[PDB]
Amino acid sequence: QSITDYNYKKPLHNDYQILDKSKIFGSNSGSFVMYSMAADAYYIYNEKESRKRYSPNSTYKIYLAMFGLDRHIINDENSRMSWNHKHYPFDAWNKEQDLNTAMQNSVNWYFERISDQIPKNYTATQLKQLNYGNKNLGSYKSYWMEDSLKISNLEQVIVFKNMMEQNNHFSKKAKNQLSSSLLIKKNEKYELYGKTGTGIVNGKYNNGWFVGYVITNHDKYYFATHLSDGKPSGKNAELISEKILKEMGVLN
Numbered sequence: 001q002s003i004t005d006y007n008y009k010k011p012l013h014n015d016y017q018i019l020d021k022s023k024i025f026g027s028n029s030g031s032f033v034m035y036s037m038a039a040d041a042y043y044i045y046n047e048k049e050s051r052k053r054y055s056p057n058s059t060y061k062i063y064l065a066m067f068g069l070d071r072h073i074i075n076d077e078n079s080r081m082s083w084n085h086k087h088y089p090f091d092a093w094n095k096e097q098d099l100n101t102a103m104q105n106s107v108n109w110y111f112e113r114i115s116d117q118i119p120k121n122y123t124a125t126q127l128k129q130l131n132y133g134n135k136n137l138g139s140y141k142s143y144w145m146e147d148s149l150k151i152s153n154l155e156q157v158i159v160f161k162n163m164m165e166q167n168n169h170f171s172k173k174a175k176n177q178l179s180s181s182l183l184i185k186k187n188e189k190y191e192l193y194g195k196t197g198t199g200i201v202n203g204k205y206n207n208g209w210f211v212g213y214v215i216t217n218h219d220k221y222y223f224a225t226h227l228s229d230g231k232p233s234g235k236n237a238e239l240i241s242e243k244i245l246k247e248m249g250v251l252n
């Protein structure tokens with residue numbers, strides 16, 4: 001919208017390492033960013049591309065979930081919402097949800113129902129305090145889905161780390177509840193948490209995301225993959241993330 005809504009230009013005041021992950025990306029285009037808690041250091045593939053701002057799509061469900069927890073729209077005894085009986089083309093959407101099922105199955109109406117209860121001024125205050133991308137709410141409708149709100153791959157990592165790790169106004173209860181909703185994989189070596197996002201424009205994939213974090217016995221890593229071309233799906237961003245985290249030794 002304005003001159004700075006498509007790119008993030010704030011200098012990293014941290015140690016950083018440039019990665020070459022181009023063979024894993026293959027025919028796809030985009031970037032990968034990871035932050036290590038123990039190192040206080042960023043590892044970035046395609047640094048320029050990582051600072052380009054894009055619609056967060058379903059990754060913004062992270063923040064809607066936190067806002068809904070923070071405003072007591074949902075809690076830990078009850079995060080249930082009944083289905084209004086509108087038929088969706090996905091059967092997982094056609095039923096009652098809780099935060100866990102809605103996050104896992106990316107059920108838009110659940111998060112839309114949350115967003116409708118949140119006053120615009122509260123969201124504006126949150127996005128400022130979080131430094132969330134361009135902070136642009138536009139018409140405040142489904143503003144996180146191929147609309148005015150945009151955020152870069154680099155910012156996805158920085159903003160999520162800061163939200164979760166700083167002592168701020170979100171409670172520990174809310175952060176823990178959001179975390180359980182994001183858990184994908186847990187074994188002896190690691191816990192993998194995250195959320196895919198896909199933007200569909202004219203039936204075509206336009207924008208793929210996977211934003212998350214890994215807890216190991218030694219460290220905690222925040223990461224994000226964005227795809228802008230090739231086959232830019234959430235599914236493919238997740239696959240690419242997994243192979244990169246593996247190569248880097250984060251999953252082992």
Ligand SMILES: *C(=O)[C@@H]([C@@H]1NC(C(=O)O)=C(S[C@@H]2CN[C@H](C(=O)N(C)C)C2)[C@@H]1C)[C@@H](C)O
Nearest residue numbers: 057058059090092105106196197198199234
């Ligand atoms: C979020 O970005 C969108 C929805 N989220 C995702 C995603 O997680 O990447 C998809 S893609 C895929 C298509 N149908 C699947 C589904 O909903 N179920 C199997 C239950 C997920 C959506 C397109 C967007 C609409 O905000």
